[PDB]
Design a protein around this nucleic acid. Structure first.
Lengths: 124, 242, 110, 93, 143, 129, 173
RNA sequence: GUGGGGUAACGGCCCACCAAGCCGAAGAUCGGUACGGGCCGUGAGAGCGGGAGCCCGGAGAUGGACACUGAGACACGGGUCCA
RNA sequence: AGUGGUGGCCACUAUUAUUGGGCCUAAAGCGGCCGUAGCCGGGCCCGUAAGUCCCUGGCGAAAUCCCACGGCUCAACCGUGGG
């Protein structure tokens, strides 16, 4: 499972024994790993309490924004730099804060595809 | 182990505001969520059985509620788990009887009888204010009810003011303000079932609400919190208050 | 100058962090304590110490205890050891960081 | 003899509620039929609509407590008053 | 010198001192470390069921002289072997080889030995689910 | 090394008494000691007393009246509220109000009976009867 | 949660002094068990416990509880109407033994003997305040002392029951 | 600490990088022991000892481990494997 | 209408000792000295109010406990009211 819970070690260091099983409310979910493709492929996910959330597994277009506040829907050519990891830019992975190359030029992603389901960025 | 929401409530754990014998039986009516909190309400079923003696057995009480012979705030209610809370008006037209729910000096609720003409007015504390789309102002009361009004009328109201609500048709009658010298009836605390006048409002930062000081009829001064202070008149109580 | 709701002047420096209560998105709600800085080595971190006297019901004397607390040190104030500081409960921030410095009542040299 | 301590009126249920005491010095606790047929006299009540719930016989006392109903119509008692006490009073086989 | 410390701010070490010397006694240390409950052949049980093997008579310690009858029994609970004293007159006559018995402690000082018999820690109460004393009185009959 | 003036003072008083001399010269004189000496003198347990500026720490001269069964200094300064004096009184007195206790309170060190009348707790310092 | 016994056993069961004193007492009052004497001593002692706690007690609750104590003592018929807390300590066991229902009925002349009064009480031949009581250990209030009367249905109620003749002769004799 | 991920949600919960911290003689670490409280037994009380019976909170469904339905579950009277 | 035997727990016990224990002869002061943390520390003046104390709001839920009253024949138990 993906369990987002207690560290097995105390702050001082004494290893912590578990006293109960894990809880479904406490587990997480797989990583989206949003990628560059020719079309937008998305998965809606039922979530805790019946909510919903859509998840981009492949992205084709982006909403870039001018500093003035005017938005352009455009395509995404390739990712320039991913500060989150070095493996991601090599594998066209799309993540918030990444520097991306579109037809307009250089943009910085200011949205999370994993949770938002769309990719917004600011022209630089 | 427990795995979610309860549906029961043992008699022994019942709130201290209910004049209910506790070791006679074990099971009581768990109130469903509603206008007033667990700590300031009781199921209507106990009102019918104990506080009015109209029903000896809960089944018969439920039958009478099914007949819909009871008017709370000018609305019939069949739910025998309704939280009938503080400063509500219970009206029986078949008997022409009208009471208001009010705590005790000890911290328990009693049905103080009131005149029929008063039975249509309900004062509501203004718990909070909010802006809803369309720039409309929505006010959330102490009892959980909500009232919508215009942007222009926003300053007519402020939190901690009392609105004399016309419950039969939901019409706003008067807005008693919170300012120095108002007449205020306490709701909770050691000073419960006290009525006095305000001299000072203690502006308390660091997470602690406003402590108002109340001056009683005899001139004795005491203190309580803002939220426990419920205004009922500028200089005299506009409702019969024991 | 933005208000924290605690009677203390604001730090002169304006930092760009998202974790300065005077210069960020985070809030404050919970108790306020006071204490002394004992260690500052980890980045943007502080361990505040607090001494107090505790009463032994069987012995009717007093036990002086020392209590430590981890908290976050924003760069605007830059707390150092030897300094009397004010601490407030804050949003969970790290594995253990759950309090934040709000001011330096008195630095070490004084 | 029978002496009424209280008569009250449930208007929401259209019924009279009667608390009374029965004096039976040295003589066994009376049967239900006799107490019903004798209480029926002095309040001008229909036998069918009237039901007696409990006659508590006190230890070491010549006074037994008694508590009874008096409805106004046949349908209401069937609708409300549960079958068992009707069987005890005989109003249902 | 004066008993010490006694001050306002010295409660900690006074407490430590007394905890240290609390190990000086015997009863508390015996309770906390549960020495009996790892040495007990009865496993804390007031009475235990056993099977007898052999009849043994012993001599009272001097200056008391007298032949005391007793039996050796293997515990059904765990299987240790222990001797139980038979009180009464003519008791051994009732008991014989291979007999179910019920046995408790002798009630000596700290549960230890009693009087003129050495180390014997137990006495029988029921043999084959029949109580010893009445058989000593003879009111009932052994099975 | 001298560490507590008051205890040495009251011990010195009692040790004079059981002999029963007339004049005593408490070498460690302090302002608090003088207040104390006023306390029981207001119940005449001692006669007059005087302060003498010795140039070093003062010395108190005191006459005895032969009426001190025992006068000890409660050393660990137990703080006590009003409502429980009877426990501590029973801790240090032979019988009901048979003597006094000296309590330091917010207003000034003095006896215990009035401190009950004024209804203010404090910190026990000395007992005597 | 377990309900406690209402009496306190003597700290030593074979002191000659106390044993003979209790013997004299139960000879005088013909009680069935020393448990009874112990119970009566217990409520005596708890009265005194309240008295002693209160005599040193200061506070509004203390005064109110004190007045409650005095009032209940008076109502039992164990004290004068001008009684003051100081005297309650002087209350003896015999003060309560007299107030026993059985001792009262024998003292009313209605019995020739203490045990005969007991037999009447169990057999219900006595009534108090129009209600029958079967327990000779019940403690009677002062206000009821005038109402202690023969139970109506009792054969002894009639003035012709042959035992009642001997009762009357003992009363006058 | 920087930047992200996933979550109902904040956070080393995870992940990539950057640093050398943090706890311990006012006893960590390790072991022995053990559900926590309202309480109860005893004592003149200081105190000592214990958490079975009711109520509140916590944890479990032979042991482990993993899903679906769902507002609420890893679900005594629902499912899958291993022992 | 219970009593006896056994086992375990508090008192007995100032034989666990702060209240409240001993250490020359009964077991108990190390061979001596130095000193770190800890503990205890001379008096006077100014300030503080951390401790300490008085008053005051919220809170420490119920059941169990103390007390008066009412119901159960009394009691135990229950209710109302005060701690």
């Amino acid at each position: 499972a993906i369990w987002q819970g207690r560290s097995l070690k105390k702050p001082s260091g004494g290893r912590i024994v578990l006293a109960r099983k894990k809880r479904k409310r406490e587990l997480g979910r797989e990583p989206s790993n949003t990628r560059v493709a020719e079309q937008d492929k998305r998965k809606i996910i039922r979530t805790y309490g019946g909510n919903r959330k859509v998840r981009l597994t492949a992205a084709a277009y982006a909403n870039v924004f001018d500093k003035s506040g005017k938005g352009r829907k455009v395509r995404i050519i390739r990712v320039i730099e991913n500060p989150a990891n070095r493996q991601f830019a090599r594998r066209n992975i799309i993540t918030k804060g990444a520097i991306i190359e579109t037809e307009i030029g250089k943009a910085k992603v200011t949205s999370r595809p994993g949770q938002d389901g769309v990719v917004n960025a600011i022209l630089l | 182990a427990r795995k979610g929401p309860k549906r029961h409530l043992k008699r022994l754990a019942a709130p201290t505001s209910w004049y209910i014998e506790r070791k006679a039986y074990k099971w009581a009516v768990r109130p469903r969520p509603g206008p007033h909190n667990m700590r300031t309400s009781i199921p209507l079923l106990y009102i019918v059985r104990d506080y009015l003696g109209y029903a000896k057995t809960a089944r018969e009480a439920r039958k009478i509620l099914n007949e819909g012979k009871f008017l709370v705030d000018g609305r019939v209610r069949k739910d025998y788990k309704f939280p009938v809370g503080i400063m509500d008006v219970v009206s029986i037209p078949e008997t022409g009887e009208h009471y208001r729910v009010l705590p005790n000096r000890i911290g328990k609720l009693i049905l103080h009888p009131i005149s029929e003409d008063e039975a249509f007015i309900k004062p509501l504390r203004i718990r909070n204010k909010r802006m809803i789309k369309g720039a409309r102002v929505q006010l959330n009361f102490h009892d959980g009810t909500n009232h919508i009004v215009s942007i222009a009328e926003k300053d007519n109201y402020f939190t901690s003011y009392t609105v004399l609500m016309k419950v039969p048709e939901r019409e706003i009658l008067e807005v008693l303000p919170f300012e120095k010298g108002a007449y205020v009836f306490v709701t909770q605390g050691k000073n419960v079932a006290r009525k006095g006048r305000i001299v000072e409002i203690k502006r308390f930062p660091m997470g602690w609400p406003d402590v108002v000081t109340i001056e009683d009829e005899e001139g004795e001064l005491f203190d309580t919190l803002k939220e426990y202070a419920f205004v009922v008149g500028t200089d005299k109580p506009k409702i019969s208050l024991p | 100058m933005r208000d924290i709701g605690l009677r203390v002047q604001p730090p002169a420096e304006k930092c760009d962090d998202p974790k300065c209560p005077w210069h960020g998105n985070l809030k404050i709600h919970g108790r306020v304590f006071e204490g002394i800085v004992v260690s500052d080595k980890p980045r943007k971190t502080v361990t505040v110490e607090r001494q107090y006297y505790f009463y032994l019901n069987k012995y009717e004397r007093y036990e002086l205890r020392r209590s430590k607390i981890h908290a976050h040190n924003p760069p605007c104030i830059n707390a150092k050891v030897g300094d009397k500081v004010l601490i407030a409960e804050t949003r969970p921030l790290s594995k253990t960081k759950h309090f934040v410095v709000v001011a330096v009542l008195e630095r070490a040299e004084e | 003899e029978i002496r009424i301590k209280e008569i009250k009126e449930n208007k929401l249920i259209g019924r009279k509620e009667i608390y009374f005491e029965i004096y039976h010095p040295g003589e066994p606790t009376p049967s239900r039929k006799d107490v019903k047929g004798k209480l029926v006299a002095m309040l001008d009540l229909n036998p069918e609509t009237t039901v007696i719930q409990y006659i508590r016989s006190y230890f070491g006392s010549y006074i037994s407590k008694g508590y009874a109903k008096a409805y106004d119509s046949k349908e209401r008692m069937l609708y409300i008053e549960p079958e068992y006490i009707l069987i005890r009073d005989g109003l249902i086989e | 010198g004066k008993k010490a410390p006694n001050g306002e701010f010295a409660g900690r070490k006074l407490k430590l001192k007394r905890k240290k010397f609390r190990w000086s006694d015997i009863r508390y240390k015996r309770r906390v470390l549960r020495l009996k409950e790892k040495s007990d052949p009865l496993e804390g049980a007031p009475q235990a069921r056993g099977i007898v093997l052999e009849k043994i008579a012993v001599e009272a310690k001097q200056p008391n002289s007298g032949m005391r009858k007793a039996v050796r029994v293997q515990l059904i609970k765990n299987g240790k072997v222990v001797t139980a004293f038979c009180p009464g007159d003519g008791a051994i006559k009732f008991i014989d080889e291979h007999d179910e018995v019920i046995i408790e402690g002798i009630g000596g000082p700290k549960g230890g030995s009693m009087g003129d018999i050495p180390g014997i820690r137990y006495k029988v109460v029921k043999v084959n689910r029949v109580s010893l004393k009445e058989l000593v009185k003879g009111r009932k009959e052994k099975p | 090394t001298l560490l507590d003036p008051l205890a040495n003072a009251l011990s010195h008083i009692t040790n004079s008494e059981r002999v029963g001399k007339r004049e005593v010269y408490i070498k460690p004189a302090s302002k608090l000691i003088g207040e104390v000496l006023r306390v029981m003198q207001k119940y005449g347990y001692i006669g007059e007393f005087e302060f003498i500026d010795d140039g070093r720490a003062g010395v108190y001269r005191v006459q005895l009246l032969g009426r001190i069964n025992k006068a000890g200094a409660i050393k660990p300064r137990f703080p006590v509220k009003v409502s429980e004096f009877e426990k501590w009184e029973k801790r240090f007195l032979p019988a009901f109000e048979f003597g006094i206790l000296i309590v330091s309170t917010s207003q000034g060190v003095m006896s215990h009976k009035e401190a009950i009348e004024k209804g203010i707790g404090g910190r026990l310092i000395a007992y005597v009867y | 949660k377990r309900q406690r016994k209402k009496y306190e056993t003597p700290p030593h069961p074979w002191i000659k002094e106390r044993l003979d004193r209790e013997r004299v007492l139960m000879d005088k009052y013909e009680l069935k068990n020393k448990k009874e004497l112990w119970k009566h001593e217990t409520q005596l002692k708890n009265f005194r416990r309240r008295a002693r706690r209160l005599l040193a007690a200061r506070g509004k609750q203390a005064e109110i509880e004190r007045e409650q104590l005095l009032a209940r003592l008076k109502r039992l018929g164990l004290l004068p109407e001008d009684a003051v807390l100081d005297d309650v300590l002087s209350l003896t066991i015999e003060d309560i033994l007299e107030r026993r229902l059985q001792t009262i009925v024998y003292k009313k002349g209605l019995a020739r003997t203490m045990r005969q009064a007991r037999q009447l009480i169990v057999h219900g031949h006595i009534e108090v305040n129009g209600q029958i009581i079967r327990s000779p250990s019940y403690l009677v209030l002062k206000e009821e002392e005038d109402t202690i009367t023969y139970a109506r249905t009792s054969p002894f109620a009639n003035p012709q029951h042959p035992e009642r003749m001997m009762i009357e002769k003992a009363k006058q004799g």
